[PDB]
Design a protein around this ligand. Sequence first.
Ligand SMILES: [Cu+2]
Ligand SMILES: [Cu+2]
Lengths: 134, 134
Amino acid sequence: ATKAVAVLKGDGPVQGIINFEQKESNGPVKVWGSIKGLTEGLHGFHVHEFGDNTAGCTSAGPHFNPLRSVGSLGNVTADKDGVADVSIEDSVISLSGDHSIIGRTLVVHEKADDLGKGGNAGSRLACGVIGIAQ
Amino acid sequence: ATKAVAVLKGDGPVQGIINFEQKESNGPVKVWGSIKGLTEGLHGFHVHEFGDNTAGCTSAGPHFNPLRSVGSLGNVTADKDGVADVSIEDSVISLSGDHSIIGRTLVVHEKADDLGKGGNAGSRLACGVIGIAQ
Ligand SMILES: [Cu+2]
Ligand SMILES: [Cu+2]
């Protein structure tokens, strides 16, 4: 596909809408949107393997790792008002092929992803299946 | 993918969980599950174009159809207690390729689909994005 969207919903104040767009088949995917209701600071932002909402965020499974994982988008950053303004360009994920995240689940975490440099990401606050958008 | 699921939800009492499984990459897709809260009788059952939940079932767009539409899955049948136990096999939709319904929306309608043989489907009661399942 060319465009997609994930509506992030959970049991709490955290919610948001994240859009995805990829023009070239093997080109980067632009990810942008906003999430609010967050504790100030960094929050793990990943694509988890299953777009299964039968138990909400709980049935999403582990990170998408077709074989950091392909689903690891890093962190989003919430300001003191609890809002994270998202704008990313990623060339590992795709909206088509073996790396397609279409039909999988976008998750924002309670904690930061230390990305392997914690010098020594918690629960899934809000999640959404990634669907093909207009 | 080889398996998928959609959780149907809407404004009213109609709820359901529908599973999909496709053994061979180009083979038929088996659809099964249950839906409750429906009026006895036939109810249009289709895959709509977009897996966009930003505006309920309204943002799902039209019937999925790459060239009955590809997206039409016929009707489901609610029994006298409003339960539609679903069991369908379809060789036109797929879980990969140009006819993939992954990332799109499954919708159960208020009225029957006449399938072009009405002798001369209404509102969207519930819907859910179709996601990859384990
Ligand atoms: Cu995660
Ligand atoms: Cu329809």
